[PDB]
Amino acid sequence: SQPDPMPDDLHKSSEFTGTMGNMKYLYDDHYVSATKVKSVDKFLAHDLIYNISDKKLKNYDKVKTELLNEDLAKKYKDEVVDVYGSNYYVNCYFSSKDNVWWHGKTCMYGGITKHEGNHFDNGNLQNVLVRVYENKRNTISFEVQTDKKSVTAQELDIKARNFLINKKNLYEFNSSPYETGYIKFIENNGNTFWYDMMPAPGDKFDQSKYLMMYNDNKTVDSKSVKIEVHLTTK
Amino acid sequence: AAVTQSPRNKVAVTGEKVTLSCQQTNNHNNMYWYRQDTGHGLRLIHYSYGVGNTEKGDIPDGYEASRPSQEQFSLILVSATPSQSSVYFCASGVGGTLYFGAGTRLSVL
């Protein structure tokens, strides 16, 4: 259980001088989602490939998800699963070793949950509350919904940030109205953990490497988990 | 055609939001938006290394950009100014080869 961050543990948007659009892009109504699927291929040992087609546009029919190591991949390799995460295209690589070089491809990290046993009845959705703090005062709270009993932290993070882009301009094209932000998860068993919401300093943003934190395929219990988003303004 | 720009000629008024679109057929990773003005070569505004990516060029100020698909790269003047009057050229490229569109002439009145 990691200590909460101090202001020196946190990326400042004011030190990022590239395009904050490339961070907004990963969160702004952007996700791969699939229900009741099974992996069809592998590229490297720690990854799995699924046949999932893009809904919104037609940017992909194949998705590769990378996990921590080969053991984690073997756990899920033959399993019927659901998928939810944030995908990227720059530096996304994988042989389809069939050529099939004419098929759209996309990549992501973790996002995998066993399907059987993980769903509610008759289309019911579990709410998860997100409380937001700006400059160390509660401002608003909102709910996000998921269809999973055990849900990746990644799915919830994406839903939380999507809402905040639209409600709070969390990320804009050029910069952010916030200087720092982290999203903090609190499990009923007392375990906490957090993700920095701001890009590393400098004039470039590496989407793949930012998303790689979802590597661990970390799941929380939707019924009981708590979430806080902590922001300071510019 | 490798590269197509839409529209080819446009009139706008100060403060209008103007979007210029460019479609390529080559599935190149890289796309570019430039403006051509007197006393300058083509100056790079934003470019893109692939879907979901855009990067500022030498004169990004008072423009945004969007790369929603391999084929599409848009340039967005979010509140147009007389100085944004220009001829704008989209390119796709691979290695040292650039494939230009025919140009879009924009008057901001």
Same domain, A143 and A222: yes
Asked whether residue A163 falls in the same domain as residue A218, the answer is yes
The answer to whether A174 faces chain B, any CB pair under 8 Å, is yes
Alpha carbon distance A68, B102 (integer Å): 47
Give the single-character DSSP code of A56.
S
Judge if A39 and A73 occupy the same domain: yes
DSSP 8-state symbol, A108:
E
Instruction: Pull the structure tokens for residue A145.
Output: 């919904």
**Domain termination site, one of A83, A98, A116:** A116
The tokens for B75 are 């340039």
3-state secondary structure of A209: helix
Q: Report d(CA A167, CA A164) in Å as an integer.
A: 5
Q: Tell me how the structure was determined.
A: X-ray
Both A144 and A232 in one domain: the answer is: yes
Give the count of domains, chain A: 2
Distance between CA atoms of residues B46 and A196, nearest Å: 27
Q: Same structural domain for residues A22 and A75?
A: no
Minimum Cα–Cα distance from A207: chain B residue: B53
Spell out the domains of chain B, with CATH numbers in brackets. Answer: 1-109 (2.60.40.10)
Same domain, A138 and A213: yes
| Interface touch B54/A22, C-beta < 8 Å | yes
Q: Which residues contact B99 (CB under 8 A, 6 or more apart)?
A: B2, B3, B24, B26, B28, B91, B92, B93
A146 plus A158 within the same structural domain? yes
Q: How far is B55 from chain A (nearest CA, A)?
A: 6
Question: Which residue on chain B is closest to A25 by alpha carbon?
Answer: B52
C-beta atoms of A18 and B56 within 8 A: yes
Query: What percent helix, strand, coil does chain B show, rounded to 5?
Result: 5, 50, 45
Same domain for A141 and A99, yes or no, is no
Note whether A194 and A102 are same-domain residues.
no
Domain boundary among A116, A132, A151: A116
Cβ contact, residue pair B53, A207, below 8 Å: yes
A116/chain B closest Cα distance in angstroms: 33
Q: Do A148 and A127 fall into the same domain?
A: yes
Are the beta carbons of A167 and A174 closer than 8 angstroms?
Answer: no
Task: Please indicate, yes or no, whether residues A197 and A103 belong to a single structural domain of this protein.
Answer: no
C-alpha to C-alpha distance for A70 and A229, rounded to whole angstroms: 32
The CA distance from A92 to A4, in Å, is 32
Picking from A81, A116, A151, the residue at the C-terminal end of a domain is A116
Residues A91 and A175 in one domain: no
The CB density around residue A186, as the number of other CB atoms within 10 Å, is 17
> At A84, which CATH number?
2.40.50.110
For every residue of A156-182, DSSP letters joined together read HHHHHHHHHHHHH--S-SS--SEEEEE
What is the span of the domain harbouring residue A133? 1-30+117-234
Query: What's the CATH code of the domain at A21?
Result: 3.10.20.120
- List the alpha helices (DSSP H) in chain A: 21-27, 70-77, 153-168, 207-211
Task: Kindly state the helix (H) or strand (E) to which residue A32 belongs, with its residue range.
Answer: strand A32-37
Distance, in Å, from the CA atom of B73 to the CA atom of A104, rounded to the nearest integer, reads 17
Q: Give the amino acid at A135.
A: N
CB contact under 8 A, A59 and B65: no
Comparing CA positions, the residue from B78, B106, B104 lying closest to residue B3 is B104
* CB crowding A90-120: b at 16 or more within 10 Å, else e: bebebeeeeeeeeebbbbbbbbbbebeebee
Angstrom distances, CA of residue A91 to CA of A85, A106, A191, A208: 17, 10, 34, 7
Dihedral sign (CA A221, A143, A84, B48): negative
